[PDB]
PDB file of C-alpha atoms in Angstrom:
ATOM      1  CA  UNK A   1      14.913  -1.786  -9.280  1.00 11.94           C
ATOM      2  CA  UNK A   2      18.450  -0.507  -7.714  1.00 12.67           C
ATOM      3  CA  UNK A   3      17.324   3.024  -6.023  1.00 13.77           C
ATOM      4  CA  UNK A   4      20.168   5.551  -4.883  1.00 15.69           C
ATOM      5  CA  UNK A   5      19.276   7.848  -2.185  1.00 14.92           C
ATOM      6  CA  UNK A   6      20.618  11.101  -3.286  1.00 13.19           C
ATOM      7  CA  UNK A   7      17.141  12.439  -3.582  1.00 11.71           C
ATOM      8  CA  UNK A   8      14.233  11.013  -1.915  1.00 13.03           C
ATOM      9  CA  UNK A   9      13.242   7.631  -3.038  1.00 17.58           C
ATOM     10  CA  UNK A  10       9.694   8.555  -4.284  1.00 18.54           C
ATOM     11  CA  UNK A  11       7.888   5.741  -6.159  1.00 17.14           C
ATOM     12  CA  UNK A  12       4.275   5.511  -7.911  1.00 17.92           C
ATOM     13  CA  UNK A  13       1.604   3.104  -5.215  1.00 18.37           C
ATOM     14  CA  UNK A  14      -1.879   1.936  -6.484  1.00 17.25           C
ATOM     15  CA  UNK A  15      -4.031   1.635  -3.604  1.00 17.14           C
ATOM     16  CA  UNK A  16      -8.081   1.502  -3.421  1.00 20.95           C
ATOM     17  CA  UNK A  17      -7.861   1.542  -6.961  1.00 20.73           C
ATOM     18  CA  UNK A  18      -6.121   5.181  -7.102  1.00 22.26           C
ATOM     19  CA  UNK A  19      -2.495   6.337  -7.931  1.00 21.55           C
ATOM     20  CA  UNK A  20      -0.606   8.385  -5.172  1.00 21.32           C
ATOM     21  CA  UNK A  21       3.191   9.294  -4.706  1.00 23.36           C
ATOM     22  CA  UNK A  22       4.934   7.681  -1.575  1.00 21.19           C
ATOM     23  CA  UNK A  23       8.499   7.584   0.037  1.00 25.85           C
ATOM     24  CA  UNK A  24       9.863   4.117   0.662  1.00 23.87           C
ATOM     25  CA  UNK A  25      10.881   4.540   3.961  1.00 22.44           C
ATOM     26  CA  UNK A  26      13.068   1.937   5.787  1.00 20.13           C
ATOM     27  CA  UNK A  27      12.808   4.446   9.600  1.00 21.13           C
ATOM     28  CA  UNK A  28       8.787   3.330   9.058  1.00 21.78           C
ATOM     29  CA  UNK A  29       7.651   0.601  10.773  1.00 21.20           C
ATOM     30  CA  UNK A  30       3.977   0.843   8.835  1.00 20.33           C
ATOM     31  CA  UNK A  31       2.249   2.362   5.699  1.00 19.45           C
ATOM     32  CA  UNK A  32       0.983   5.436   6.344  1.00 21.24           C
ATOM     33  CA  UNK A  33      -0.932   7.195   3.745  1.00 21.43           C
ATOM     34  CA  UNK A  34      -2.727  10.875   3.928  1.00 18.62           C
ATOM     35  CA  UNK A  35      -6.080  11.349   4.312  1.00 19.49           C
ATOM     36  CA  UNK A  36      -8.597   9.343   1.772  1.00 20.79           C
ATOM     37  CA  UNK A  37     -11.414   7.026   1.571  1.00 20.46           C
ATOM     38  CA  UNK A  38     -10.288   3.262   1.693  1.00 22.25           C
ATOM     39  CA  UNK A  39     -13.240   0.203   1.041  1.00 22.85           C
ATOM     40  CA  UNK A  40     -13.816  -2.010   4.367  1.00 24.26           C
ATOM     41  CA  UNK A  41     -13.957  -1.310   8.379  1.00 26.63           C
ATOM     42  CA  UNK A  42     -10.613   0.398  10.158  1.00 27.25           C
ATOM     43  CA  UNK A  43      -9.712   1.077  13.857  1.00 25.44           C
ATOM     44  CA  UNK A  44      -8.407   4.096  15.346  1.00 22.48           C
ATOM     45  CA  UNK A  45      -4.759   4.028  16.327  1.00 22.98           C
ATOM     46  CA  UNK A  46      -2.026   6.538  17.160  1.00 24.27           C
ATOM     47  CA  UNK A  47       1.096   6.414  15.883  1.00 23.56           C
ATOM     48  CA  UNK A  48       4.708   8.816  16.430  1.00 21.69           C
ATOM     49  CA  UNK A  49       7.496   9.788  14.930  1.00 21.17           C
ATOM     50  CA  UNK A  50      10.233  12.809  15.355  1.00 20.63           C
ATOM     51  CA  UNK A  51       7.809  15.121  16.165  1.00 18.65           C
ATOM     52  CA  UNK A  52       4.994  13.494  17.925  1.00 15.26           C
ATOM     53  CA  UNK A  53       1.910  11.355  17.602  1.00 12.65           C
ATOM     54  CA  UNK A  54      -1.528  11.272  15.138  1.00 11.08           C
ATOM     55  CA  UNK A  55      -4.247   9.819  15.231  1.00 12.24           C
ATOM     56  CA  UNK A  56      -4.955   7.368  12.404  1.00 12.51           C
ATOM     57  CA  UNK A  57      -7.661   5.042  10.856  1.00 10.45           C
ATOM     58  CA  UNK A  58      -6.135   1.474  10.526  1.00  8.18           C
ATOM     59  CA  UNK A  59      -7.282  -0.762   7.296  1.00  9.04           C
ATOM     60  CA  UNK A  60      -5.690  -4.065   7.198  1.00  7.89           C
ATOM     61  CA  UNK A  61      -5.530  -6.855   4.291  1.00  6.10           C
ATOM     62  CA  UNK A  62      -5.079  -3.977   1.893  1.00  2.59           C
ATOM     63  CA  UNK A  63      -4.150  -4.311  -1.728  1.00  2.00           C
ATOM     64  CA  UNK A  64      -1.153  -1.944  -2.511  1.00  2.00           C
ATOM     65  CA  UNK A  65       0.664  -2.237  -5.633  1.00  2.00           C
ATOM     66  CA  UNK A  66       4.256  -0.343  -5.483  1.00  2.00           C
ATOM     67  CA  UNK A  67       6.142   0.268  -8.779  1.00  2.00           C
ATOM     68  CA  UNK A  68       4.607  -2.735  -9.760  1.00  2.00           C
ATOM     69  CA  UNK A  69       5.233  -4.782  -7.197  1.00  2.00           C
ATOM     70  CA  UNK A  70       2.249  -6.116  -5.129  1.00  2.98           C
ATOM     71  CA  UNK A  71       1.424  -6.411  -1.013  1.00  5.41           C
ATOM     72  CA  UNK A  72      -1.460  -6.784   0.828  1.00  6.86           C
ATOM     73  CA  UNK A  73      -1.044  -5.455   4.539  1.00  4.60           C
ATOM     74  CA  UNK A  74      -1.928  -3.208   6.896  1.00  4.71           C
ATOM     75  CA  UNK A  75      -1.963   0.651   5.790  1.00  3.76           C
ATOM     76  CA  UNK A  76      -2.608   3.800   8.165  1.00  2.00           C
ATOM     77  CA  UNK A  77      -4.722   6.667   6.981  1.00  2.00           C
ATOM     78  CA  UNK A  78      -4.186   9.469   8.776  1.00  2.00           C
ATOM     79  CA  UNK A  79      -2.462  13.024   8.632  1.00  3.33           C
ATOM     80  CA  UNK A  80       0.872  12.457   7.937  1.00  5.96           C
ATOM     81  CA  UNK A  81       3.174  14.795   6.216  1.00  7.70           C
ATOM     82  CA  UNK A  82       3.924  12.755   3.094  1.00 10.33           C
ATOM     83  CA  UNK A  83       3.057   9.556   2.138  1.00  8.54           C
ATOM     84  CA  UNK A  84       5.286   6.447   3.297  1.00  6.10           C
ATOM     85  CA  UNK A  85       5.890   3.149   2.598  1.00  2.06           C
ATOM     86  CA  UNK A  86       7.055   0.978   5.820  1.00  2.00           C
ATOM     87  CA  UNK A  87       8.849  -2.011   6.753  1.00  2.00           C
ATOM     88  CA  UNK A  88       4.901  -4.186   6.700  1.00  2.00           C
ATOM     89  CA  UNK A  89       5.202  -3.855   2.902  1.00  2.00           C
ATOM     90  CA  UNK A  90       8.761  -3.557   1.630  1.00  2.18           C
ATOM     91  CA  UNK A  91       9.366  -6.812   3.210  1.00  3.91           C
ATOM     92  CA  UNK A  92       5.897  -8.387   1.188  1.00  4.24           C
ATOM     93  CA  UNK A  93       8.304  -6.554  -1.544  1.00  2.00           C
ATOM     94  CA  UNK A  94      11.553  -8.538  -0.601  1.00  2.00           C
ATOM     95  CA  UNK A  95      13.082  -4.522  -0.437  1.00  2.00           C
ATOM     96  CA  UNK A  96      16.668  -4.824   1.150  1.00  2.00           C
ATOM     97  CA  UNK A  97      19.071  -1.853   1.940  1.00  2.00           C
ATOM     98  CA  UNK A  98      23.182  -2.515   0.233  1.00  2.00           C
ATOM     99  CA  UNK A  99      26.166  -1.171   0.606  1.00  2.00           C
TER     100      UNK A  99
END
């Protein structure tokens, strides 16, 4: 799909087998998803942004499906404010920015 940006671009994910809402965010390096249960071993990590760093449970080689669209990378579980999609999987999505 085209997506404009005057509100934010929020798009359905499939992930561990479960549907969540996520913003495809091109400022995001990685995935980071709230708190949940994902299948296999992870590795703590901290990650920042504006307003400081969290802690975070790392799972790679993960299966994420994004408006249809299919990657298998590295996502972040952890406490961040809303769910986002980063630059590891919008490029597995061939996701550009235009203008």
């Amino acid at each position: 799909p085209q997506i404009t940006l005057w509100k934010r671009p929020l798009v359905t994910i499939r992930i561990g087998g479960q549907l969540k809402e996520a913003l495809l965010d091109t400022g995001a390096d990685d995935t980071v998803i709230e708190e949940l249960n994902l299948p296999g071993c992870w590795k703590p990590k901290l990650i920042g942004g504006i307003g400081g760093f969290i802690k975070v449970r790392q799972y790679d080689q993960i299966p994420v499906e994004i408006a249809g669209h299919k990657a298998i990378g590295t996502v972040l579980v952890g406490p961040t404010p809303v769910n986002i999609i980063g630059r590891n999987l919008l490029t597995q999505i061939g996701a550009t920015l235009n203008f």
